[PDB]
Amino acid sequence: AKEMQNVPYTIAVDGIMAFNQSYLNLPKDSQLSYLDLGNKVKALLYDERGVTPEKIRNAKSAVYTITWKDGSKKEVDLKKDSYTANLFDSNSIKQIDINVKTK
Amino acid sequence: IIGGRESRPHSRPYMAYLQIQSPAGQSRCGGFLVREDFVLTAAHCWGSNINVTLGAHNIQRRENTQQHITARRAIRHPQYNQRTIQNDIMLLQLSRRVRRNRNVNPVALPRAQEGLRPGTLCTVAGWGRVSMRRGTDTLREVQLRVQRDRQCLRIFGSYDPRRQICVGDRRERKAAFKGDSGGPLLCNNVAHGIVSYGKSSGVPPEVFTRVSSFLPWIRTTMR
Amino acid sequence: IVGGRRARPHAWPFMVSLQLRGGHFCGATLIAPNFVMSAAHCVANVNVRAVRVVLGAHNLSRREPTRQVFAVQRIFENGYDPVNLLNDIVILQLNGSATINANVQVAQLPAQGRRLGNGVQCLAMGWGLLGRNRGIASVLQELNVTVVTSLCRRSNVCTLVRGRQAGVCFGDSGSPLVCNGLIHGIASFVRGGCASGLYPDAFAPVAQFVNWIDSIIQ
């Protein structure tokens, strides 16, 4: 408690989603970047659904959507290597939805 | 469970609730007791540490009927395919035998290729979310129909009828959903299936692991 | 910021820290007693009413009586495009006017349409990560950079440090790029990581928005 926030996330690859209910742990009241978070999303994709960097690079689309505590959503293209140079609070992420489509 | 009802407390005494923890992550699944020392669940529910709760109805309360047992072994099928979610089956060897009673007792598995015909009505139970917005603290259940294989072949490209079951009518909002993975497809008091995967919307049909296809491995793994 | 040096105390009194719940998250530039200029992406997904605009700061990890704190009254965007990182500039009007003194001064902007060619020597600055190895910076950091056009777009001003791994990093978004005493850039994004030594850092091109800026602050 008070050490980690548990951010729910889902992974869909090619329209198929496993029906577990999973959470990504972030240090509570910490700050992170889009590089940190993108790397976490890529590691989740590989470990849980075997999605490789090569599969992301060659996918039709590969995104993840952050739902923020203030209700706004932001889509991040996993195929891009450009990252805005800001920091955001770990407490401000409510949900992450990862969606990869190979075609 | 989408479109279901709260179960009558302790009417599904084989049900297991799984809390899975790994470095910087956690997961929740269902499962079912198949012997005093073994719980069957989905392979994608695996993690570094797994706590098994049996005898539960409200998993958010400390109920006197609950037994909490850690998984000594978490045996994913050796050919589990995380990419396609195939061979999606796991055996949990419990650290101790359960205390068997009216609230905790195993469920039978099917015979060698025990017939499961399309149109058969089965029950799926679990503690998964009931919508995009709400979960549940208590066990819920829904009745679903086995489909002909064609209903899953177009929408799920890696669906294999030899190893998986197609469940649920596409025009109903009755389905298993997030957190129900690993729970049983119960048909005529026999666990024919394991909740595995489906569409991210929760719209049916969905794919269950066909238990009868993995009976040899199950037996070899439990003895 | 990565591979830079501490700024002299209050050497850049137009420098601003944007903070939420005590944490610096982006930089900004004071462009009028009641107007601050930052990157649009810095406020795209935050509660603007909780943003604190801190002027006159040097070392964010110590108590400094020189500091002046304001809230964000309203914001002005110029067609920010989150998908392509175009028009990454925002103006935050404060709930009051700063006291102009030795620690708090208003920056100066170039003229509309001014484009800087390859080789112009600029200074970047900010309180962002020191490379993530030393964590976030306490003392405002500065770095000598050079404007480059290669591996970049006409819609950005891009800088590189030749010969070593140095550049802006996370937390430097919104901070000014200073060339010839004028604010020509607002830190926008990096490629692949901080201080790669292969890709330039990209700044919003202040000079292409000057007309717009004036219609807000004058």
Curated annotation (Swiss-Prot), chain B:
Record-linked SMART domains: Tryp_SPc
Main localization (coarse): membrane
GO biological process assignments: angiotensin maturation; antibacterial humoral response; biofilm matrix disassembly; cellular response to lipopolysaccharide; cytokine-mediated signaling pathway; defense response to fungus; defense response to Gram-negative bacterium; defense response to Gram-positive bacterium
Pfam families xrefs: Trypsin (PF00089)
PANTHER family: CATHEPSIN G, KALLIKREIN-RELATED
Glycosylation: residue positions: 51
Domain Peptidase S1: 1-223
SUPFAM superfamilies named among the record's database cross-references: Trypsin-like serine proteases
Organism: Homo sapiens
Topology class, membrane: Peripheral membrane protein
A cellular component annotation (GO) from this entry: collagen-containing extracellular matrix
Subunit structure: (Microbial infection) Interacts with CASP4; the interaction is promoted by the Td92 surface protein of the periodontal pathogen T.denticola and leads to CASP4 activation.
Record: active site: 44, 88, 181
Protein name: Cathepsin G
PROSITE patterns, A to Z: TRYPSIN_DOM (PS50240), TRYPSIN_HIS (PS00134), TRYPSIN_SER (PS00135)
Swiss-Prot record, chain C:
Keyword Nucleus on entry: no
Effect ascribed to mutating residue 102 to T: In SCN1; uncertain significance
UniProt note on tissues of expression: Bone marrow cells. Neutrophil.
Location(s), subcellular: Cytoplasmic vesicle, Phagosome
Its job: Serine protease that modifies the functions of natural killer cells, monocytes and granulocytes. Inhibits C5a-dependent neutrophil enzyme release and chemotaxis. Promotes cleavage of GSDMB, thereby inhibiting pyroptosis. Promotes blood coagulation. Through the activation of the platelet fibrinogen receptor integrin alpha-IIb/beta-3, potentiates platelet aggregation induced by a threshold concentration of cathepsin G (CTSG). Cleaves and thus inactivates tissue factor pathway inhibitor (TFPI).
Disulfide bonds: 26-42, 122-179, 152-158, 169-194
Enzyme Commission number(s) of this protein: 3.4.21.37
Effect on the protein upon substituting residue 174 to C: In SCN1 and CH
A single Gene Ontology CC term: extracellular space
Major place of residence: cytoplasm
Active site feature: 41, 88, 173
Residues bearing attached sugar chains per UniProt: 59, 95, 144
Keywords assigned: Cytoplasmic vesicle, Disease variant, Disulfide bond, Glycoprotein, Hydrolase, Protease, Serine protease, Signal, Zymogen
Signal as UniProt keyword: yes
Effect after changing residue 32 to V: In SCN1 and CH
Mutagenesis / variant outcome for changing residue 52 to P: In SCN1 and CH
Result of altering residue 91 to F: In SCN1 and CH
Species of provenance: Homo sapiens (Human)
Name of the protein this chain belongs to: Neutrophil elastase
Catalytic activity: Hydrolysis of proteins, including elastin. Preferential cleavage: Val-|-Xaa > Ala-|-Xaa
